[PDB]
Design a binder for these strands. Structure first.
Length: 86
DNA sequence: GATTTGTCAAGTGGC
DNA sequence: CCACTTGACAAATCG
């Protein structure tokens, strides 16, 4: 309940894999849209589509009154996720 | 100064 | 409706 990565586990593996692969989170190294789709098996574009849904859908999920201020290039990948959600 | 990267509007098409 | 591609496009990117 102390970081974003925890709430990443509320989506299908695709919106999880696409997010983690793209933001350098959870062991993966931050990757281009193309390299993520080549490793999943989808087009460069659909990966952004999977990204935005899971990103937009992560905003809905975060409306559980999480005391938004908690622990929010010097930007560690977790902090690159939040400002991508909202 | 071109290649790469993200993005758009419109496209196929239904293990 | 859905997952997904196609083919354009400006802009970030890199040297």
């Amino acid at each position: 309940k102390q970081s974003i990565v925890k709430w990443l586990f509320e989506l299908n593996a695709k919106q999880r894999e696409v997010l983690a692969r793209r933001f350098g989170l959870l062991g993966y190294e931050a990757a281009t849209l193309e390299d993520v789709g080549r490793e999943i098996g989808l087009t460069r574009e659909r990966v952004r589509q999977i990204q935005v849904e899971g990103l937009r859908r992560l905003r809905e999920i975060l409306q559980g009154q999480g005391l938004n201020i908690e622990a929010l290039t010097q930007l560690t990948p977790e902090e690159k996720l939040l400002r991508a959600i909202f």
